[PDB]
mmCIF file of C-alpha atoms and ligand atoms in Angstrom:
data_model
loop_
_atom_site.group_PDB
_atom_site.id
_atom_site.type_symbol
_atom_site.label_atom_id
_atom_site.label_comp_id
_atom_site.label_asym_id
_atom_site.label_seq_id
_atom_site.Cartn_x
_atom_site.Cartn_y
_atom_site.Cartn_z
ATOM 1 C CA UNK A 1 81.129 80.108 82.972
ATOM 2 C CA UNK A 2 82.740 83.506 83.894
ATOM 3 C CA UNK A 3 80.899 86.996 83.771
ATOM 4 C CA UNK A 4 80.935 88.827 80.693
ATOM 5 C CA UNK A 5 84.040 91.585 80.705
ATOM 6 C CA UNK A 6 83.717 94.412 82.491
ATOM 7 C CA UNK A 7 82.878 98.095 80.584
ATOM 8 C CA UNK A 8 85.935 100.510 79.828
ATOM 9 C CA UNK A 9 84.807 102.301 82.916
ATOM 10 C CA UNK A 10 84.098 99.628 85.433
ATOM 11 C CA UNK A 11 87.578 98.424 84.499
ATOM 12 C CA UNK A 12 88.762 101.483 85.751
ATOM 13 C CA UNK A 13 86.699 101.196 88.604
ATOM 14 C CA UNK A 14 88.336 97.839 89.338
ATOM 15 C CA UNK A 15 91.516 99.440 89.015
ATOM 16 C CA UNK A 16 91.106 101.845 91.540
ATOM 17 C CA UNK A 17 89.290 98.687 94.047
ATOM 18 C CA UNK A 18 92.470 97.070 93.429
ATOM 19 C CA UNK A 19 94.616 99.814 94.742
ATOM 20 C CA UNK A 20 92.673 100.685 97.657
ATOM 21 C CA UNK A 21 92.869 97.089 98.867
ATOM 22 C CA UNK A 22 96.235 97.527 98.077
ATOM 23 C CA UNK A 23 99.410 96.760 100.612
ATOM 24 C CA UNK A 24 100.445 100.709 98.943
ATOM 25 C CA UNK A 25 97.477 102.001 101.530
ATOM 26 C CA UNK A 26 97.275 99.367 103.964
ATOM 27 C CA UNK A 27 98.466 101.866 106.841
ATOM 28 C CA UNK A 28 94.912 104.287 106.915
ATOM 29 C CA UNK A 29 92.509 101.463 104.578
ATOM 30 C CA UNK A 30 92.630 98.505 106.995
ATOM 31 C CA UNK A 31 89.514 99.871 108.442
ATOM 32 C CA UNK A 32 87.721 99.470 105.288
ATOM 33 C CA UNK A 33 88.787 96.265 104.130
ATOM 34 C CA UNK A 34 85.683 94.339 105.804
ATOM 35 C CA UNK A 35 81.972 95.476 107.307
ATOM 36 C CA UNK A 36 82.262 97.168 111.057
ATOM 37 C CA UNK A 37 81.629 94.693 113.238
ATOM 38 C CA UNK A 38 79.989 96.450 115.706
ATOM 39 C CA UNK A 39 79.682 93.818 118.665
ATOM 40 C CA UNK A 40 83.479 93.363 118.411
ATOM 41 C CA UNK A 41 84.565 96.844 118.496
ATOM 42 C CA UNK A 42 81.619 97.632 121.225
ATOM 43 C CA UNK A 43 79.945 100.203 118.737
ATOM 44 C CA UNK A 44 75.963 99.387 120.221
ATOM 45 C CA UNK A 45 74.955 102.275 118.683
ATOM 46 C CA UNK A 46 76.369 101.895 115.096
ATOM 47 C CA UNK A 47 73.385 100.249 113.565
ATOM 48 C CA UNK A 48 71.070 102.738 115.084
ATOM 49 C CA UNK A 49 73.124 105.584 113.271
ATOM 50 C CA UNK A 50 74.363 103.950 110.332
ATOM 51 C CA UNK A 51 71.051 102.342 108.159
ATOM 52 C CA UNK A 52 73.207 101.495 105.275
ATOM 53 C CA UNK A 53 76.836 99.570 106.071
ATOM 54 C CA UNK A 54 79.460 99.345 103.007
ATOM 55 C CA UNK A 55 83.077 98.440 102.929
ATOM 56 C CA UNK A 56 85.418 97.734 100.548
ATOM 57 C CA UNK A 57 85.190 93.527 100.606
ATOM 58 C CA UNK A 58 81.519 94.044 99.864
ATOM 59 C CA UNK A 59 82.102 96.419 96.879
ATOM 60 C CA UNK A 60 84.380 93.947 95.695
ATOM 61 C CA UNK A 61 82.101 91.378 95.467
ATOM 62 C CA UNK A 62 79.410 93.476 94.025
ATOM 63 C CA UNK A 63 82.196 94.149 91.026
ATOM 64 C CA UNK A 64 82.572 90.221 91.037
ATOM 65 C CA UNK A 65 78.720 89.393 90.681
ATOM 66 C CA UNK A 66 78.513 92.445 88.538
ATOM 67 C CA UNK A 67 76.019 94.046 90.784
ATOM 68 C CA UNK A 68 77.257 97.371 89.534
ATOM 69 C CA UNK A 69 75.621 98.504 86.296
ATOM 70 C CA UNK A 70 78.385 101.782 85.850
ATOM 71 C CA UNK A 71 80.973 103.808 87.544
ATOM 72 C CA UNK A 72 78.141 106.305 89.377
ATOM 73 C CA UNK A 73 76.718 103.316 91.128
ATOM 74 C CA UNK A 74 80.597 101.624 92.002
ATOM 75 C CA UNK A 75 81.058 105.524 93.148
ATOM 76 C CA UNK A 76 78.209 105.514 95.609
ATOM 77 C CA UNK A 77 78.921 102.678 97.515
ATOM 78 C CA UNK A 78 82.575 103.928 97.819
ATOM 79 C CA UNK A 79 81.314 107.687 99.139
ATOM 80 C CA UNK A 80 78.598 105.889 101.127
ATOM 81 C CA UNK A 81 81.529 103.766 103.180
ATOM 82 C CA UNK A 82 83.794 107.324 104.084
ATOM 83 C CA UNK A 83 80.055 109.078 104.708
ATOM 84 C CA UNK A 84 79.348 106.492 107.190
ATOM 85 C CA UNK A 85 82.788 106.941 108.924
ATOM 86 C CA UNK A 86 81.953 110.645 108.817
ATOM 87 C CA UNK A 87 78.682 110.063 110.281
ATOM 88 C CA UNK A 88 79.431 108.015 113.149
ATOM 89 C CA UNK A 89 83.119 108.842 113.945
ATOM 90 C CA UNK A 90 83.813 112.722 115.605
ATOM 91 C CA UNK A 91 85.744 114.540 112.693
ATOM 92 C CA UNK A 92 89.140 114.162 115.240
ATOM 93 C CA UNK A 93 89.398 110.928 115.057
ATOM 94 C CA UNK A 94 92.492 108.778 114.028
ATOM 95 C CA UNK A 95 89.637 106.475 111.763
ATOM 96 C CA UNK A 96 88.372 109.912 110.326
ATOM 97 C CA UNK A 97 91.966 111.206 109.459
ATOM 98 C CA UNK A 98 92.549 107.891 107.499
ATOM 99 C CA UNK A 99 88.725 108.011 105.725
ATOM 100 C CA UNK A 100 90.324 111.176 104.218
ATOM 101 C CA UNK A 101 93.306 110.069 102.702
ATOM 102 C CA UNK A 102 92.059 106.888 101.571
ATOM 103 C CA UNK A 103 89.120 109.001 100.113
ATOM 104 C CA UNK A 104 91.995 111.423 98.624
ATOM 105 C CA UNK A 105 93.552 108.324 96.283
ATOM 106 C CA UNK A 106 89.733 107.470 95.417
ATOM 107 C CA UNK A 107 88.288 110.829 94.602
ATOM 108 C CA UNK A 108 91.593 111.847 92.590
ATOM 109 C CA UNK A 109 92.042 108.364 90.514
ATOM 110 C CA UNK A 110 88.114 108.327 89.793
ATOM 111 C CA UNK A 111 88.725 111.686 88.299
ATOM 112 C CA UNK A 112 91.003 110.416 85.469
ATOM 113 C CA UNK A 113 88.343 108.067 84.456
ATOM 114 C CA UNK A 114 88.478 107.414 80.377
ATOM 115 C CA UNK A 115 85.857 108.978 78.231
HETATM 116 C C1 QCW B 201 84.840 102.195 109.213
HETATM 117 N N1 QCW B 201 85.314 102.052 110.577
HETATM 118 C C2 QCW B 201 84.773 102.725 111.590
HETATM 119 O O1 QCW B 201 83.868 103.542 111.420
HETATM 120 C C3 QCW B 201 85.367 102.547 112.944
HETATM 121 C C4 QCW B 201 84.772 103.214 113.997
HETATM 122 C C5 QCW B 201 85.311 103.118 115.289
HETATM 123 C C6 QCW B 201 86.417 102.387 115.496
HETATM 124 N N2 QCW B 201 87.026 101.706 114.472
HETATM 125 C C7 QCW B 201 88.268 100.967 114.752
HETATM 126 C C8 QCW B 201 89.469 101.877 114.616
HETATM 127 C C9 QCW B 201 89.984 102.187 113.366
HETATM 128 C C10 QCW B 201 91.053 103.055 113.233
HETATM 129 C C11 QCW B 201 91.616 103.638 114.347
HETATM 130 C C12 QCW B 201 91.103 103.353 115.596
HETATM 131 C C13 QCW B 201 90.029 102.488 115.728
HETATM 132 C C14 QCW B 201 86.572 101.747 113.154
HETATM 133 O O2 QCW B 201 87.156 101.125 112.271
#
């Protein structure tokens, strides 16, 4: 059987998931589609730095398995994901640039969340 509907404000929550995997802001959120692999990108340091991992694949299937009790807790992992990237990346650099626009669409869309 299927998971019991969403709440008005997870929907929206789901809404905004959708658009940030969306081919609309594929240019800067392609870093963010699927957990840092560290290994690959030669990052032997990242795990040392960064205790807590997110991305947006794993958000979406904590929305799926409807890990996600409200919007505050959907929020955090988002804000967690750019804080890493802010964390571990210098503030010039091209991943850093596109953490702040993608974090732009999120931060303004959350804000028009129904109530
Ligand atoms: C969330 N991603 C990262 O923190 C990250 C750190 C370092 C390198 N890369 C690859 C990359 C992306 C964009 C431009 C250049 C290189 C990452 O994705």
């Amino acid at each position: 059987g299927s998971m019991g509907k969403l709440s008005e404000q997870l929907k929206h929550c789901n809404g905004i998931l959708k658009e940030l995997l969306s081919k609309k802001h594929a240019a800067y959120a392609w870093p963010f589609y699927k957990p840092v692999d560290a290994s690959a990108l030669g990052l032997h340091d990242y795990h040392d730095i960064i205790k807590h991992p997110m991305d947006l694949s794993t958000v979406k299937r904590k929305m799926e398995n409807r890990d996600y009790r409200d919007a505050q807790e959907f929020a955090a992992d988002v804000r967690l994901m750019f804080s890493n990237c802010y964390k571990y990346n210098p503030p010039d650099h091209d991943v850093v640039a596109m953490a702040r626009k993608l974090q732009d669409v999120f931060e303004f869309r959350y804000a028009k969340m129904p109530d």
